[model samples]
Target: MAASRRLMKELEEIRKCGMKNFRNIQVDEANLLTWQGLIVPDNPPYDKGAFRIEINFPAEYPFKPPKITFKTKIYHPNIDEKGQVCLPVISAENWKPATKTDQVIQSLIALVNDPQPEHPLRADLAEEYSKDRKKFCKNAEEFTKKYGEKRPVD
Candidate 1:
């Protein structure tokens, strides 16, 4: 009861104000806890395309962190084939109950813009990103163009 009601307040705020970082918010008719949106990553390699992601807020949302999954394929070091990301802000180790949705997106955007190679989901991509940035860009952009969606026009 509380979870669904809490979602309504946050949901309307998001809809009314909107966001440039993450747009096209869509929620499942049966579940208000689940949200899907397109994350428009800023930066050279990822700036060309828009990546869709699903955010599933747990029943005890504000208490537990939300799970974000990439629906679009991305050639990145922090994201694995499973489309799971390692965001410390949302991780159990570092997550704060007071964290908001926008902060989570900002964290993800910051990570995608700058590859954090030390802790990596895809080792090969991290290696490529750390040592061969140009090569990584070539492959990443190629993958994004094929698997990523076209961004909204200004």
Candidate 2:
């Protein structure tokens, strides 16, 4: 009962006190458990626009951590073609109920900005990232442009 209750309050606070990088938050009153938002990266290469992502919280929220899946394609070493990302913040080992939704998204954006080659989801991309920085960056710029969403400047 308190799981959705906490979700209700916490989600409100997050929307009320918004974030810079995680600018656009889309939520439906029908299902407060699942949420969709736009994650705009502050780093180069992926600085084009924003990426679509969704967060899923189980009924046992504080007991079970939320999971994020990228709907937009990204050419990052840590994110796979299928849009799976490995973020340390919500990882089983590092998760805590006290971990705020804002905190989780912050770590995710940072993780996207910083490519972790050692344990990357895409080893081929990680190899390219480690060996040749130029080619990797070039490909990344184009890949993101081709697959990622482009938001217009107001």
Candidate 3:
């Protein structure tokens, strides 16, 4: 039930957006409501690195926003100390049943490209990103490449 509805929604968005980030998008092979993904950078600094993100749909999904988090130990302003992501729409403050998982995922990607320094989850990283975009991108690449590498297939 959850799988069918969620899969339909995800596929529709992918169709509209085409494909991105080395074509690594995936809705769980077994459970459609769960998605595992890898996002790669397009420009300099982070060009060759990849960031892994996971999405979990609520059992009563579409009625409740799904839970999403980074699979990588990313160092970013919006990403918390434990790697928990802090996105505006994902929070209780702005969530609506009408929100799509794709939009939430896109927001996270945007955060990576453009962090919100004022509300950084990691104060130090937030400062770095605000003070030095070049250094911030460099640091992000290092962390993503080193810690966010592909996991062994089960």
Candidate 4:
């Protein structure tokens, strides 16, 4: 099986950007296909500690979207009880061959910063995030401390 030049190039780009984005997080050194990182959200509600995540790229990647799942349990509007993000890019509805791993990872980081309401995975949490920002942050912070791994305790 031959690897696509486009895929190799895209993976290279992801590698570069990922090093910056996932600086503090512990990423798997042996396996680039399967990556792991920690997200230490800062900004009320979600600011507490770190949240672990695992990313798996497909062999036919760039043509097929990679799989993103949260390793640590988190309660978020766009993340299901099982931590599967309810985002369209990874799903069949909006996946495209042009999608790059770096872009997807960047998008995931953005998603963590901004969550959607209409397409929420955790309905209750969405409600809280939308209605009560303070309480939402409280719960998110609690979750960060409880589930997320320690990373300088920010």
Candidate 5:
């Protein structure tokens, strides 16, 4: 019940203070633990389009961190083929009770803008990003156009 209340409160805050590039926040009428939304990165390569992500809250939220995974395919160093993200703040070792959903969103935005090549889920992509920035950006942009372009909602 605590998790439900906390999730509702977080949802209210998100509605009150709009999230950047966030669109279509949906939680099942019967469940508050799973949230799905779109996030259009504000930086280059990814800025050309939008992406969808699923945020799943644990039963012991506030004490445990939520799991965030991309639903759309992305060409990035910190994100894997399986859509697993490599963000330190959300990781078990670094997560804090005080961390908010907004902060996590902000960190995701920052990750798109400035990827950490030193720590990557895709070492090949990291090498490409660091070795040839142009090629990496070009590939990312192409991927965005192919998979991340915002389609009109019916």
Candidate 6:
């Protein structure tokens, strides 16, 4: 269908140009719908390590946005313990057919560098971030060092 073609096309684009702050793109020949890659933050608090994430494209991609989840545990106000990310750009309601996969990766990179505490999924973490940025950053750094270490992409 159209989604399959679109994904194949996008995969080629990704393989050729690559995305910023993201690498190790893996797209199975038998499974073009699932993708796994690493995200390396360019800013503080998350710069010390690389986080792996998975992107699952639906059969109706270009019409429906892909679902992205962290394969690596991360400490972020917008990311849950289970690694679900809460970002409006990729939400069903806000998704646009023209949005590219690279754009989504860029948004995720931005989210990690500049968390949106105002609209947080983890209220307690947001409160800590707002009330004590230094402590929050310290904890984040520790978590990144512990759980976000660079690993071989699978």
Cα RMSD for candidate 2? 1.5
Clash count for each candidate, listed in order shown:
0, 0, 0, 1, 0, 0
Cα error, residue 43 of model 2, in Å, equals 1.4
Off by over 4 Å in 6: 151-154
Instruction: Give candidate 4 misplaced runs (Cα > 4 Å).
Output: 2-8, 18-20, 24-32, 152-154
lDDT of each: 0.85, 0.83, 0.70, 0.69, 0.84, 0.85
- Cα distance off (Å), candidate 1, residue 120: 1.7
Report the lDDT tens digits of candidate 6 across residue range 79-146.
98998997677799998888777777888889998999988999989999999999999999999989
> What's the lDDT for candidate 5?
0.84
lDDT of 2 by residue, 39-118 (tens): 88888788875799988887788877888999998888988788887888787778889888877888888888878798
Q: Please estimate how well model 2 matches the true structure, expressed as its whole-model Cα lDDT.
A: 0.83
Residue pair clashes in candidate 6: none
lDDT of 1 by residue, 31-58 (tens): 8788998888878798889888899999
* Candidate 5, superposed: residue stretches over 4 Å from native: 151-154
Where does the lowest 10-residue lDDT sum fall in candidate 1?
Answer: 10-19
| Model 5 TM | 0.92
- Cα shift from native, residue 60, model 4 (Å): 3.2
Task: Between candidates 2 and 6, name the one with more favorable lDDT.
Answer: 6
What TM-score should be assigned to candidate 4? 0.79
| Sliding window of 10 residues with minimal summed lDDT for model 5 | 145-154
Between 1 and 4, whose TM-score is larger?
1
